[PDB]
Design a protein around this ligand. Structure first.
Ligand code: CA
Ligand code: CA
Ligand code: CA
Length: 513
């Protein structure tokens, strides 16, 4: 039997901005009080699954940052329509519950960012209802100055608006319940400063910025607004971290990075139509390595400190398992390795690590089904328009997958441990690809502080590849890690400069020390 190369390699917990993030759709995660709605104490009850605080022992997932979807008061189950920016929705808990969450996450080395919704407010937010009332009395110099309120003629036939009195209306791209803020208003920028300070004063590590695409409009430069907001928050907390949801083309993502924001989600590489899943299906390894290098480096031109944010799917998209599980469990495992071993901060969507699927593609709520911690004791959370009992994931719930050495979950755990053993992976830049005369093999060099690693993926579903590593590639090369999905007891070795890379497997080569 070939020895596991990561045995007796010490792992280290992150203490900086580089993290394996976990996105929690709060209503669907964990109910702690029987009302069929997930809540903050439910999250607290599962923190030892997410990270037990020891990267060298235990059976936790090992994620070291959480992004909570909106948690502030709102009449909806998703809460992107924010009615109060200074409290917790009562169904999720109180500010005391929130403070205990921060405390217990930080004890385990888990950072926390909040979903911050700056493009729009709820139509029932009192700041807005006051504006509606003033505008109906033809008063425009009061609360109307917070919002994107103009005469109706100002708006284009295709821009959704909320009709107000005296011939006015408010921009509202997403919904009649989501009137948009005027991001150039001095009053609005003072208010956003107060909101940010309120949450940063509670130990929040940063924000996920909703709907960044809609920051830009006819009179607003989204990059100027975001630079203003990011710089303001950095004055409050120098090491603040933000990731922007900028659901747009590569050129506009590159442009918004001039704001200085740490990260934007890499939509190009996500979903069944995106680069990673498409190329796993096509066995296009070389193409993938090229695209990851070129994208990460291009974004770093606009922000040299860019932290890319790769992901397979999020709460707005069909679950990645709906495309990958039918291709085989080893394809799901390879997909995890590919997106999580790219530079930056990958985002795991809750339940992805146990293969939750979406029951349909016609209701957003199908992307937000109930988390399954134990398939023998299913949860009871009501999911809008779907129901209150989940399907059993193909591999079982968390408990079952931890016990199966060949599970999807344990492959995610091993990827995280490998990253905790090799800080260059997340923190470096790709300085080149490595060809192995084979379109099926994708390989690249990631380098951080003059330490260079060679990451090699074999995208073949059925064929192993015998590769030769030379001193010109990696001097005094050794096998640093392997990820071999067909069996958790199968490992490889670098012997006489040759290494066999099994199907859909990943190896990491490093110089001897
Ligand atoms: Ca509850
Ligand atoms: Ca552990
Ligand atoms: Ca806007």
């Amino acid at each position: 039997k070939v020895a596991d190369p990561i045995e007796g390699v010490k792992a280290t917990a992150s203490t900086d901005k580089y993290r394996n993030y976990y996105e929690i759709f709060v209503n669907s995660f964990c109910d702690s009080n029987g009302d069929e709605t997930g809540d903050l104490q439910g999250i607290i009850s599962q923190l030892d699954y997410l990270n037990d605080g020891d990267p060298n022992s235990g059976d936790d997932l090992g994620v070291d940052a959480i992004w909570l979807t909106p948690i502030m008061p709102s009449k909806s189950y998703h809460k992107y329509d924010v009615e109060d920016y200074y409290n917790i929705d009562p169904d999720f808990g109180t500010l005391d519950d929130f403070d205990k969450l921060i405390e217990e996450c930080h004890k385990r080395g888990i950072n926390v960012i909040l979903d911050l919704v700056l493009n729009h407010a709820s139509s029932k937010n009192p700041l807005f209802t006051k504006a509606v009332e003033e505008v109906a009395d033809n008063k425009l110099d009061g609360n109307a100055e917070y919002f994107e309120i103009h005469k109706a003629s100002y708006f284009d036939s295709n821009t959704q608006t909320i009709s107000l009195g005296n011939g006015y209306a408010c921009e509202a791209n997403f919904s009649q319940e989501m009137p948009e803020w005027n991001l150039n208003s001095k009053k609005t920028r003072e208010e956003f400063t107060k909101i940010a300070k309120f949450w940063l004063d509670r130990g929040v590590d940063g924000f996920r910025l909703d709907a960044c695409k809609y920051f830009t409009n006819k009179e607003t430069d989204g990059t100027e607004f975001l630079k203003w907001f990011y710089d303001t928050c950095k004055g409050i907390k120098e090491d603040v971290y933000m990731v922007g949801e900028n659901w747009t083309d590569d050129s506009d993502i590159q442009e918004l990075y001039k704001s200085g924001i740490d990260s934007q989600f890499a939509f190009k590489f996500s979903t069944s139509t995106g680069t990673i899943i498409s190329n796993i299906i096509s066995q296009g390894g070389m193409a993938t390595a090229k695209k990851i290098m070129n994208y990460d480096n291009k974004m770093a031109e606009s922000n040299p400190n860019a932290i890319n944010a790769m992901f397979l799917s999020n709460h707005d998209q069909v679950r990645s398992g709906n495309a990958l599980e039918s291709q085989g469990l080893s394809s799901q495992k390879l997909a995890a390795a590919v997106y999580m071993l790219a530079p930056g901060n990958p985002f795991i969507y809750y339940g992805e690590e146990i293969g939750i699927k979406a029951p349909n593609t016609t209701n957003d709520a199908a992307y937000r089904t109930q988390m399954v911690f134990d398939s023998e004791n299913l949860p009871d959370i009501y999911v809008n328009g779907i129901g209150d009992e989940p399907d059993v994931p193909t591999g079982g719930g968390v408990k079952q997958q931890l016990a199966d050495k060949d599970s999807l979950l344990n492959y995610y755990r091993r990827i995280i441990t490998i990253k905790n053993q090799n800080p260059e992976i997340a923190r470096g830049r790709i300085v080149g690809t490595q060809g192995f005369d084979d379109k099926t093999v994708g390989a690249y060099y990631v380098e951080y502080e003059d330490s260079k690693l060679l990451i090699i993926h074999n995208f073949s579903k059925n064929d192993a590849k015998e590769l030769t590593i030379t001193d010109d590639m990696i001097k005094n090369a050794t096998l640093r890690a392997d990820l071999i999905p067909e069996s958790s007891s199968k490992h490889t070795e670098l012997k006489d400069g040759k290494i066999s890379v099994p199907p859909q497997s990943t190896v990491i080569i490093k110089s001897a020390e």
